[PDB]
Amino acid sequence: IKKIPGGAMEESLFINGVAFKKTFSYAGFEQQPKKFNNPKILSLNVELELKAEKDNAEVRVEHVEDYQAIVDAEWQLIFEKLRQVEETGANIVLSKLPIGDLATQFFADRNIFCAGRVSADDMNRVIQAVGGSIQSTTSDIKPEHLGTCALFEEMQIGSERYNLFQGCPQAKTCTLLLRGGAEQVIAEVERSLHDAIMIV
Amino acid sequence: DIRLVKKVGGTIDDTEMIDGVVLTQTAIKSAGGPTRKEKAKIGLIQFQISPPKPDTENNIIVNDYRQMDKILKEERAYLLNICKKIKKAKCNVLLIQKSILRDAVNDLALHFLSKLNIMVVKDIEREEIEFLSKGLGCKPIADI
Amino acid sequence: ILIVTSNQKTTISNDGATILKLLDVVHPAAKTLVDISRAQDAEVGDGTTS
Amino acid sequence: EMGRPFIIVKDQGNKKRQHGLEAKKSHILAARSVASIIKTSLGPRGLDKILISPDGEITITNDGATILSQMELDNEIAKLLVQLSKSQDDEIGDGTTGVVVLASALLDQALELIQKGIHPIKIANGFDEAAKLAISKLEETCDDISASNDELFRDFLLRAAKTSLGSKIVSKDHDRFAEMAVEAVINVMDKDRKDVDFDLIKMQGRVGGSISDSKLINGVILDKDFSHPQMPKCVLPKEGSDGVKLAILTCPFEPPKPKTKHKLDISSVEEYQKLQTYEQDKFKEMIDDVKKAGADVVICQWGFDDEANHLLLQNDLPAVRWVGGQELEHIAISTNGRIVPRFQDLSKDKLGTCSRIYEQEFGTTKDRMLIIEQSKETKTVTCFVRGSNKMIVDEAERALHDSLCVVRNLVKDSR
Amino acid sequence: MREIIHISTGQCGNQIGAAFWETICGEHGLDFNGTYHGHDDIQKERLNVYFNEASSGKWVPRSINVDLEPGTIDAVRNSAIGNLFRPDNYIFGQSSAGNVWAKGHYTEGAELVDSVMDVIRREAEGCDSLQGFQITHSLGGGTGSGMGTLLISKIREEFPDRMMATFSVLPSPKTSDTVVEPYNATLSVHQLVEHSDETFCIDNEALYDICQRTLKLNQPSYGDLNNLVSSVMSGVTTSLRYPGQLNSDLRKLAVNLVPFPRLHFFMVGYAPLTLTVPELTQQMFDAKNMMAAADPRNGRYLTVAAFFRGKVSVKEVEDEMHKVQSKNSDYNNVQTAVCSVAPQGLDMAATFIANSTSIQELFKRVGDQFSAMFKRKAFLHWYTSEGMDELEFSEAESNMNDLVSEYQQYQE
Amino acid sequence: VQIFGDQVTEERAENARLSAFVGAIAVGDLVKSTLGPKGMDKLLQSASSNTCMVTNDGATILKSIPLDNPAAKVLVNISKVQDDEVGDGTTSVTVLSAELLREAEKLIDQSKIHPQTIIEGYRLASAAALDALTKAAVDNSHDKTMFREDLIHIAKTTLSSKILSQDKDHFAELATNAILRLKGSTNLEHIQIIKILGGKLSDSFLDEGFILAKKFGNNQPKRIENAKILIANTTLDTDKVKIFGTKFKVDSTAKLAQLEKAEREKMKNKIAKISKFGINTFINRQLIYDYPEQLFTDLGINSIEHADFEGVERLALVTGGEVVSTFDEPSKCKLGECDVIEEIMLGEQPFLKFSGCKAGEACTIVLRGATDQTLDEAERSLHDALSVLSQTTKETRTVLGGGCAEMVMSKAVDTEAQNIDGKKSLAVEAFARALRQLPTILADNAGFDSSELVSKLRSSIYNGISTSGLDLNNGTIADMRQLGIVESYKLKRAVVSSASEAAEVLLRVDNIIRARPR
Amino acid sequence: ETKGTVLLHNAQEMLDFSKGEEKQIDAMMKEIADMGVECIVAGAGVGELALHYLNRYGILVLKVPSKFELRRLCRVCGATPLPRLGAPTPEELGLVETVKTME
Amino acid sequence: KTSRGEIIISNDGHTILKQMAILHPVARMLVEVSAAQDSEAGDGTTSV
Numbered sequence A: 001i002k003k004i005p006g007g008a009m010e011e012s013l014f015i016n017g018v019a020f021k022k023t024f025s026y027a028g029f030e031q032q033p034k035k036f037n038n039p040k041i042l043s044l045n046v047e048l049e050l051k052a053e054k055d056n057a058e059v060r061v062e063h064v065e066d067y068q069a070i071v072d073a074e075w076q077l078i079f080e081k082l083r084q085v086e087e088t089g090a091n092i093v094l095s096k097l098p099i100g101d102l103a104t105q106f107f108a109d110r111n112i113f114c115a116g117r118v119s120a121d122d123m124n125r126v127i128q129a130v131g132g133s134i135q136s137t138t139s140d141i142k143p144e145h146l147g148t149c150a151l152f153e154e155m156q157i158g159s160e161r162y163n164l165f166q167g168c169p170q171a172k173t174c175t176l177l178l179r180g181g182a183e184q185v186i187a188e189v190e191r192s193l194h195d196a197i198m199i200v
Numbered sequence B: 001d002i003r004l005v006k007k008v009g010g011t012i013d014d015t016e017m018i019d020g021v022v023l024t025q026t027a028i029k030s031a032g033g034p035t036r037k038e039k040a041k042i043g044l045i046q047f048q049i050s051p052p053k054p055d056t057e058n059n060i061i062v063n064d065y066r067q068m069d070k071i072l073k074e075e076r077a078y079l080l081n082i083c084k085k086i087k088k089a090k091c092n093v094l095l096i097q098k099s100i101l102r103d104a105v106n107d108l109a110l111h112f113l114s115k116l117n118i119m120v121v122k123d124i125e126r127e128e129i130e131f132l133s134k135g136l137g138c139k140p141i142a143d144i
Numbered sequence C: 001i002l003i004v005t006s007n008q009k010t011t012i013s014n015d016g017a018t019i020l021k022l023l024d025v026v027h028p029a030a031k032t033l034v035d036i037s038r039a040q041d042a043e044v045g046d047g048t049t050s
Numbered sequence D: 001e002m003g004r005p006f007i008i009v010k011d012q013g014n015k016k017r018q019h020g021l022e023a024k025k026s027h028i029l030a031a032r033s034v035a036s037i038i039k040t041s042l043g044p045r046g047l048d049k050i051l052i053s054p055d056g057e058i059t060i061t062n063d064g065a066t067i068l069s070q071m072e073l074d075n076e077i078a079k080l081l082v083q084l085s086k087s088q089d090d091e092i093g094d095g096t097t098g099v100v101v102l103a104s105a106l107l108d109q110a111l112e113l114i115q116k117g118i119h120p121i122k123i124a125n126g127f128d129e130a131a132k133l134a135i136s137k138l139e140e141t142c143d144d145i146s147a148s149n150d151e152l153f154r155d156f157l158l159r160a161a162k163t164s165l166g167s168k169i170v171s172k173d174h175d176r177f178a179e180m181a182v183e184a185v186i187n188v189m190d191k192d193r194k195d196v197d198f199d200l201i202k203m204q205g206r207v208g209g210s211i212s213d214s215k216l217i218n219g220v221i222l223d224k225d226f227s228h229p230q231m232p233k234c235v236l237p238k239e240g241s242d243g244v245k246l247a248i249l250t251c252p253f254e255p256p257k258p259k260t261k262h263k264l265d266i267s268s269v270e271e272y273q274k275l276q277t278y279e280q281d282k283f284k285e286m287i288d289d290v291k292k293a294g295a296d297v298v299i300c301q302w303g304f305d306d307e308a309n310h311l312l313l314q315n316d317l318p319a320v321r322w323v324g325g326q327e328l329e330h331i332a333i334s335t336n337g338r339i340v341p342r343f344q345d346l347s348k349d350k351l352g353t354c355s356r357i358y359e360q361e362f363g364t365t366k367d368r369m370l371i372i373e374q375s376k377e378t379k380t381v382t383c384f385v386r387g388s389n390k391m392i393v394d395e396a397e398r399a400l401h402d403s404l405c406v407v408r409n410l411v412k413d414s415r
Numbered sequence E: 001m002r003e004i005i006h007i008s009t010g011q012c013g014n015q016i017g018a019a020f021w022e023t024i025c026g027e028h029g030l031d032f033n034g035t036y037h038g039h040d041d042i043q044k045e046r047l048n049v050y051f052n053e054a055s056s057g058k059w060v061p062r063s064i065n066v067d068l069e070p071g072t073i074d075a076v077r078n079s080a081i082g083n084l085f086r087p088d089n090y091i092f093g094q095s096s097a098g099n100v101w102a103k104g105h106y107t108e109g110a111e112l113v114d115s116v117m118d119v120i121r122r123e124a125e126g127c128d129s130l131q132g133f134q135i136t137h138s139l140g141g142g143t144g145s146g147m148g149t150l151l152i153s154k155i156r157e158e159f160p161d162r163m164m165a166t167f168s169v170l171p172s173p174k175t176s177d178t179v180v181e182p183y184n185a186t187l188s189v190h191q192l193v194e195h196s197d198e199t200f201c202i203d204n205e206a207l208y209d210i211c212q213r214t215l216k217l218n219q220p221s222y223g224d225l226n227n228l229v230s231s232v233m234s235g236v237t238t239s240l241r242y243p244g245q246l247n248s249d250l251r252k253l254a255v256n257l258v259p260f261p262r263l264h265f266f267m268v269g270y271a272p273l274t275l276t277v278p279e280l281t282q283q284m285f286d287a288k289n290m291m292a293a294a295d296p297r298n299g300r301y302l303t304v305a306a307f308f309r310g311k312v313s314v315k316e317v318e319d320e321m322h323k324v325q326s327k328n329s330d331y332n333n334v335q336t337a338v339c340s341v342a343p344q345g346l347d348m349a350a351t352f353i354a355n356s357t358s359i360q361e362l363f364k365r366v367g368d369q370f371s372a373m374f375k376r377k378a379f380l381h382w383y384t385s386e387g388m389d390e391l392e393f394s395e396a397e398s399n400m401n402d403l404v405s406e407y408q409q410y411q412e
Numbered sequence F: 001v002q003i004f005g006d007q008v009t010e011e012r013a014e015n016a017r018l019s020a021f022v023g024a025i026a027v028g029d030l031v032k033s034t035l036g037p038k039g040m041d042k043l044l045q046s047a048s049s050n051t052c053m054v055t056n057d058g059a060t061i062l063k064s065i066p067l068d069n070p071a072a073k074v075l076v077n078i079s080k081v082q083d084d085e086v087g088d089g090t091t092s093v094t095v096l097s098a099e100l101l102r103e104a105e106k107l108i109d110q111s112k113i114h115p116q117t118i119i120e121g122y123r124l125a126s127a128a129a130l131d132a133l134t135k136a137a138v139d140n141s142h143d144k145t146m147f148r149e150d151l152i153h154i155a156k157t158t159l160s161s162k163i164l165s166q167d168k169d170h171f172a173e174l175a176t177n178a179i180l181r182l183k184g185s186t187n188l189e190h191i192q193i194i195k196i197l198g199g200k201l202s203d204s205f206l207d208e209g210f211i212l213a214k215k216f217g218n219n220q221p222k223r224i225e226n227a228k229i230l231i232a233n234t235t236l237d238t239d240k241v242k243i244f245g246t247k248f249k250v251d252s253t254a255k256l257a258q259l260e261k262a263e264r265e266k267m268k269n270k271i272a273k274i275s276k277f278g279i280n281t282f283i284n285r286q287l288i289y290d291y292p293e294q295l296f297t298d299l300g301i302n303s304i305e306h307a308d309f310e311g312v313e314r315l316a317l318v319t320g321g322e323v324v325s326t327f328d329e330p331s332k333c334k335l336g337e338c339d340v341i342e343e344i345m346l347g348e349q350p351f352l353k354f355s356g357c358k359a360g361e362a363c364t365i366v367l368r369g370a371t372d373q374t375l376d377e378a379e380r381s382l383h384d385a386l387s388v389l390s391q392t393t394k395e396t397r398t399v400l401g402g403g404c405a406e407m408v409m410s411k412a413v414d415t416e417a418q419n420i421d422g423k424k425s426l427a428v429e430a431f432a433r434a435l436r437q438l439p440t441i442l443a444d445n446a447g448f449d450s451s452e453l454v455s456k457l458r459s460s461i462y463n464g465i466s467t468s469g470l471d472l473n474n475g476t477i478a479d480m481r482q483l484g485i486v487e488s489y490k491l492k493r494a495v496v497s498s499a500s501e502a503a504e505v506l507l508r509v510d511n512i513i514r515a516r517p518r
Numbered sequence G: 001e002t003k004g005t006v007l008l009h010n011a012q013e014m015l016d017f018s019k020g021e022e023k024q025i026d027a028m029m030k031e032i033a034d035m036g037v038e039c040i041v042a043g044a045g046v047g048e049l050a051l052h053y054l055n056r057y058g059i060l061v062l063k064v065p066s067k068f069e070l071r072r073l074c075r076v077c078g079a080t081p082l083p084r085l086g087a088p089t090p091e092e093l094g095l096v097e098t099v100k101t102m103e
Numbered sequence H: 001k002t003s004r005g006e007i008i009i010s011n012d013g014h015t016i017l018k019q020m021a022i023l024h025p026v027a028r029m030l031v032e033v034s035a036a037q038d039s040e041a042g043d044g045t046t047s048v
Ligand SMILES: Nc1nc2c(ncn2[C@@H]2O[C@H](COP(=O)(O)OP(=O)(O)OP(=O)(O)O)[C@@H](O)[C@H]2O)c(=O)[nH]1
Pocket: E010, E011, E012, E013, E015, E016, E067, E068, E069, E096, E097, E098, E099, E100, E138, E140, E141, E142, E143, E144, E145, E169, E171, E172, E176, E203, E204, E207, E222, E223, E225, E226, E229
């Protein structure tokens, strides 16, 4: 459970899933819809942006005609990497590594939400909540490994946006938002629950 | 348009009129060049006589050994043929400006210029190029 | 118990563990209480004070 | 002690302790010291306070959160009151002063009860039962406004808008700020009158002018001029057209180069002339792509090139440079356009639509700030607030922000 | 490869090495007892470059500290940082080089070097990936200079390929009181160039200026100097001990920064001497931040290589390079190496190492002292007595004519 | 219980209002001498490098002087906004906003008025004040000759306050011609003020053209006629292609001799495309190197180098042409025209003189003065004069000054004070009496009476003459239409609104919080 | 070990260089698995692409970033390590029945 | 004698006033008048 400076402790509620901070404002974040009736979750690990491929950068080009083609090839493969994510119908995209502005705007046109800048401990909680799996390659994506839930709705919580998942038939996760006045109030509610949860 | 040359030494009476323009710079003499030349035509060199090294980065690659030999030969020729064309115009005195990013006159080029009896003077200020062209009536030369 | 360490980090707690920790105990015999609090807090998580 | 150095915690002599009754008197008097600051500020007849940051900048404010936020304190009891006002400011955005005065009122009355010898838990449990009992009574007595139509529901926002503006800055034009605050929400609202997005409306202040010069404009505020200002400043649409056909691009005008470091080797003069041909044909193909797309105004993120600016002036195509990515998020939602990544994916369906583009001076030499306006209702409203002083327009921002937050609370039903 | 040994020789060598280990141990995390209290994989997964995992995880650094003055070794040992180094590693033998290249070197190479070759052998046999050796010596002293020369030679013989990195401390003309400093510093370079593969120049005189200008300590103590030297060393070694590919591993460093073989000498540059990447840009290239006496603006950079740390992206640094190249063109050279970890104490630094023709000033100087102030054959009998002749000195001055020439040949 | 930290100055008593009120009085009295035509200039002593600065404007003075009072920052900030908005009337805002707080001081102390009542009267008093200017204004848009005469009298009013009170008769014609030159362009950046020390102050002039600060490079002539101007922002010099990853894989130096020749061929080809236009002058903003400079000699084209980007905008509009790049298509591109070009010398630095251009959408002013300090004052002057006249084009309505503007507001403000019976009438009267002080300090600076001269202006307006005002050269009441002094509507609207809202700031304080300095 | 850097002369190599990797790693990993192994103890840092194919077939990964920590584990199951990424020999494969993870 | 190691003899009032660093600003205005007299006329820089 995470910290939310601001609010009153009485207005908390029970959540059947996860609620994680985005921690970054993308260029095409507002274009995506905030409400999906039948969302589908797919966890990624590949970095979706235009950069060096595998820990190195060195490209020799002799002819100027091929210099135009090698740039178009980089633009070709990056959309080929994104199109494989689009063809399976993954509405929610999540990745530990950053996601560039090129990818999030491609997803923003056809109503596909995406997010990034999340920790590995948060990612492991996402898999057990939705019941999916981790896929670090876009070519080996299949329909069966996609997680699902009842609905999706991003709500304003303490001047911070959180992506809510809830209503799963079988959820392994319980994660409640701790809102309070001072930073010690939310801390005391955490330690009190952490001591009580171990007893039960 | 008036020029005053500052110099230490001498006496006040030594100040006199000079009918023509005087150069504050001195000769290199590094190579054995002329320092006087009667009935000489003064040409203003506004470029640099130096090994080829153009604006875009130039990485020279040597694949075979004949090539090391050739690169040297070709250069001892890029300076020679340019100096050969100076003999065609019979220009006897050259004046080079201050060179940036490289040497103004290569030491290998001074051997060709010193044997053909050509005075070489470098490290002239840029603003004085208007003075020399206006006085001597010589238009600058930026390319062969 | 209200404690403020050298870095001016405010904290309010009643747990043996947090309180003892927010305290850099240099005495050797007194750190036995710190160990059993962390040992009780790590496994059970209640009754540390007791 | 027994002669040996009896030390337990690190830095023994530096830190202190406090217990018994004297620990309580330090707490209640610390709240009274903060309450005296807030007590003379609350209400419509209050008085702002002036704060001084370490960097010399000042802020003339009368909102308990901004006062306590920029206040350098040492006592921890006031630092919890600093966060309580910040808690009320972040979520609701109304009553910061109250939460502070009210918490001190509970603390001041608790001082007399501690003298009687009541345990603090029984004191705390009493306020918890009394607080829920008061909330349970006040929930019954208040009436619902959802039965009324939309014409009267607008008046209820004007009742709360005049309440929030007053007690604050711009009391002079508060009747128009109430209409301006309500008019901002009429444009940006859900058809079901529920869960309106607050992030669509951003705050923007301008140092200059007077309060009367402020007005409503539906568009984006850019702090920059057009590229190479030889064109006319105010561009108009065509005679017959759906709009100006706004275009946005996250690609700078240059030849396509790899993102990785590259080494283009030219081993011949013939290949060097083809590089000159490749250099010119890319700029020629680029301006032909946006020409065939029908765009009039172009927005570039990473800026552009001297050679395309001229190509942009002859075709009557204004453009800008160094537009940040956060502003492009605001441009796409306002004009209802889709940002194309590159020119190969350029299509007429992705271009936006807005009424007109124009720029004014606001004075002598300050800066050329861009203005955009819409011809109908859109999902974006940008308040254009002016001010005679930097502290006036700075206080007018947080004052109008609290006004929109109070209207945001009324979007929730039956409150 | 995976590991590199670190020899430290001389009073200056031992001091700088003790400071360097004090920095390194705390960097990726080990109490001076060897135990690892660090968090987590990042600091542990390249700890095998300089520490030997023993059973029980009492990591112990692979360092050979040597000196002909029992006292310096002793002080360091009895001090803190005295549990880490294995007791057997220290090799220390009386009397004192006596601040003479000739004497100290020959006499104790005759003895201390044998013992050192012995320690360098078995302890190292212990690894499976020697990559090279890092020596910290003082160019101008006795033991350090003489022994360094001997050892470098001896090691190179027993380990042909193995790279060889040095961090010799050049002498301070003003603050080096001893008169026979240049006359040693000259004989040391004679052999440093023929053998070494990459070396870094640090001048005490330059260290004083930075200590008094930026730090503003009223009187520099050898300690301050040591701390600054330690910081640059730490950055260059992180270029090594943190998983990375930009200049990954020593040999790479060498390949990248050495245009031609007879030019080993580098000018360290480090900032934020007491933050945003644009802010640190100016500090790296400021003419006052160089730890070399010679001015680099009058000279000419040949291969630049900047090692950033802390939070920095690819593009923060690339954009910075694009902006900088544009204005200092007269002075395309660039090499970036972003790291992920941060300086102990500070969030982000940026070490700077560029080959520069300007070193020829620091050698024209030393040659001037060596020749002019010993045309009179001063203080030479101290050296002729040990056994070495004067023909060797003539060879030494001759080879500096050569160094200077080289730098002049690569048209300053 | 001291909740604050160490070294935290807090004032929660009457001293807080006294410290905030005395700070505005100190800022107010500092600028009382700078107001009016007889006002004295001030002298600033900088703390770094001994760089002095002589200036009469209150905005430059208050921004330069250090002041730690928070009340002083409001007077500094309101003056900065007025300097940026209109460019004139900054000292009037500073002295009026301080006098409103001065007049409000006695209400707090003597009469014991609530602070919310004083501001409430100023709201209704300021509303009636702006309504007086609504009826008191006059629109001279129907006739250009009368509007041409209005720009004269506004220049007479603005320039009289600075050191140019004698030479305003000559610069009034110079100022209004620059505005009619711009024909509505209110951007002040399109006027280049060339600073020249030496000569008589009246030696300034306004040539019909654009004067460069630089000269021709090497051998191009001074005097020419019928020159076609072409402007470029083009590198046009050692073209570094748009991708920096380009390289040459050279197998032999003989081939690299052809590559450097190819760089000269494309540059020779680029200059060959310039000659297709058939021009005689070429201008580029980047500094031109030696090789492209030489090719212009054989073609007979002049070359100018290192022009600033802000000057390219002025250069394009005076010439009337267009900035051209990518020279393959000369048909669509446009170029300007000029009759004669000649290099001149004003002092030591030579300049290029242009005359006889077609377009006249911009100009340049050449000032002449004894000291750099006088030249600076002069510069700052024409900037304040041209700024007011530039906004007069978009805001054609004008208002008569000379004490008549402040009094006709007080005539309407005093009338409304009776219909608001209660304790608010004293606040509205305080706003009225604050407006009487502007003609008082204007009389005190010239050394006349403060009571009797203002009393004659009081009785003259209520008799039914709304054109009476103060005349300082003789010290008596005279008609403003005959003397010919008038201000713009935006100026009087700005200072009344700025001084009114400035009084609202420091009347609601009840505590001053000072944290530690950093 | 000596300057491992990519080199792509044309777009045909750019397209195949990204998937070449997947294929190769996958091949080595499949090879490992046809032998029926379900847990592999690694000696140093493991890449993410290699991890994606290991947990596909449910192969457990264990970190032992030291020499002695890796040698002590071989004595339990009695396995003979080989640094190659090929097929483990069947005689050298160790025997472990269960691998539990509890608090 | 200037601040740096340069020494200069001067009869010209403009160069005398230029090299003299004056603390008073009004007396410093005479340095600019001599500069103005030197730029415009070039004679009588001390007579002004
Ligand atoms: N940079 C730096 N140099 C040091 C420091 N301590 C000593 N030195 C240098 O050490 C040099 C002389 O010391 P060494 O030559 O190492 O002394 P030594 O010959 O090892 O001592 P003996 O063997 O006893 O003769 C001087 O030039 C100093 O500049 C230090 O902390 N930092």
